[PDB]
Amino acid sequence: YRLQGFTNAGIVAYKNIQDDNIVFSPFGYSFSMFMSLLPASGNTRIELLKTMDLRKRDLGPAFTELISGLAKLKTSKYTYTDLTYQSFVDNTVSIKPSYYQQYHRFGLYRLNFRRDAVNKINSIVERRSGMSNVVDSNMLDNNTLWAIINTIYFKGIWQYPFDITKTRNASFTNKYGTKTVPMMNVVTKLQGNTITIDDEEYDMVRLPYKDANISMYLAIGDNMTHFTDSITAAKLDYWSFQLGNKVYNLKLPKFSIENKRDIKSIAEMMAPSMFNPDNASFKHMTRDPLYIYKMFQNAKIDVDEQGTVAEASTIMVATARSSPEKLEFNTPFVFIIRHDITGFILFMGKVESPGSGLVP
Amino acid sequence: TPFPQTSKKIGDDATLSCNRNNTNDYVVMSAWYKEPNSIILLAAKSDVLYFDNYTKDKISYDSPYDDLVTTITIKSLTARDAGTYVCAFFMTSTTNDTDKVDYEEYSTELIVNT
């Protein structure tokens, strides 16, 4: 009844992002897919249990574990994580009375999607989570009948902040031949190591956050695709156990990334019937044919000398229009914001590293 | 009476408790919400997740190790603490018999007067 499959769902979702300018919330994707288990039934429920690597006997305790994990994200003010979950079902849908009695208090809203649904849903999400204009106008038509929104916000402050006295160094890529970017520099002791993963050298560093058990792990290596394709929750825990105190001259770029990615491919590889109106069985919520045809995530991260600010919104909706982005980074590094107690991976991505590397 | 009326004074500590009828299934969680669309807390065993503007200060969860009941205590009752309070049990099957989520819900009207 562990959440290993829960975290590995988002891990695989990240592993399927064919790009290098990535900023993703594995916890947001995993949480959406896991909350989908409440209305799901039959084949959809079985697929979701398979992807989470859970049985019907372990679904109850799993949620329990999840709740406990959620109880360990709002434990301070210096560093915290706020999570909100909203479901919007059309008034014409005949929701089962038991389902509504059980789950309507966890943000189940009813409206007419043909009467300015965009502004109403944006207002509800803004009132519940503070993030405004989460859903775009081209993601809602007069045909959509179901919309699930999952927002997560992480405010972080380095336990050992960078000195403002830093340099502005030029990173070398092929897209941007040479781009000058501010690079924070700090010489101090940190929990790191330089390990080998399947005969491949990777340097790992941990940056703790003040007044919390959340940490930003940084990994630097030759082929980051190899490091990406070989990470699981248990292997991540083992790598964390391999880290220890040692002196480091950290050169971390002051990066700010934003992504708006269609994740329908991986979500359909995990739950095909959820994205097919002929097989979509959500009989726990309603006997009416409901499905999801589009799934996106909008993520953003900003890192400075004081800390990190990250936002993410996972949206399951009926229609959308977007174009994929493809940037080829050379010799990048991978960051992972992880809760060291629950193993939750709140955020993770990939930033273009300077030619000198993160640890000279 | 559809709602037990718990009458208390300004400044008292109101201890609200509820009992689950199903005593043979695994309690997934126990929830407390203020019926005017306000979630107070969600207790998973001894881990309590407080929603909205709620902390361990005014409302304390008093039954972390007792699974057959759920109990909270509101401290220093004010005029805004009055209203309907709802306790709920989310339970699952222990032996995969009748695979479904069982749900219990009870309400009580707290009247805090001078």
Ligand SMILES: *[C@@H]1O[C@H](CO)[C@@H](O)[C@H](O[C@@H]2O[C@H](CO)[C@@H](O)[C@H](O)[C@H]2NC(C)=O)[C@H]1NC(C)=O
């Ligand atoms: C970090 O690690 C564990 C996580 O449970 C914990 O010992 C530290 O503080 C704990 O917070 C827990 C709730 O998240 C709670 O069970 C407990 O009161 C407290 N434990 C203490 C003080 O020994 C976590 N640290 C921080 C800063 O959150």
Ligand SMILES: *[C@@H]1O[C@H](CO)[C@@H](O[C@@H]2O[C@H](CO)[C@@H](O)[C@H](O)[C@H]2NC(C)=O)[C@H](O)[C@H]1NC(C)=O
């Ligand atoms: C707890 O469960 C028991 C057993 O189902 C309930 O006792 C019966 O309740 C029904 C209606 O809920 C009555 O028609 C029966 O007469 C009751 N007794 C028997 C012997 O069957 C009991 O009411 C439940 N308590 C609750 C829901 O608070």
